[PDB]
């Protein structure tokens, strides 16, 4: 809620505390920004395993 850990990726957890499917399912919940598209714009996308 208050601290940040912006140096550990989702893929860092598979094999240490989670499996690939569990990590992917957990990461799909959160949302991220995914660059421009067509006529510029800034949209949102579901999370991936490399964020």
């Amino acid at each position: 809620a208050c601290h940040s850990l912006n140096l550990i990726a989702w893929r860092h957890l598979v094999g240490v505390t989670h499996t690939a499917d569990e990590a992917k399912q957990m990461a799909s919940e959160v949302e991220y920004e995914d660059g421009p598209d067509d006529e510029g714009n800034m949209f949102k996308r579901p999370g991936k395993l490399s964020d």
Partner: protein, 77 residues
């Protein structure tokens, strides 16, 4: 006709400087052994390259167990 008339059991042979055939016939095993040693060293220094492992090492029996990947279904993302 003969190099030494008093002893016909003496014949000169083709050469360049000292590269006479007998010397090379003596030398050949040294070249074979040196080439084998060089091949063994090259094979030793490249036993962890993935292509070598997946082409040569694994199909070899007994030792092939060691040079595998043992990670279960939890693997690369």
């Amino acid at each position: 006709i003969s190099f030494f008339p008093n002893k016909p059991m003496y014949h000169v042979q083709p050469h360049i400087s000292f590269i006479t055939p007998e010397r090379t016939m003596k030398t050949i095993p040294a070249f074979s052994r040196w080439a084998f040693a060089a091949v063994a060293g090259v094979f030793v220094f490249a036993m962890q390259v993935p292509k070598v492992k997946t082409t040569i090492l694994q199909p070899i029996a007994f030792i092939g167990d060691h040079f595998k990947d043992k990670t279960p279904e939890e693997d690369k993302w």
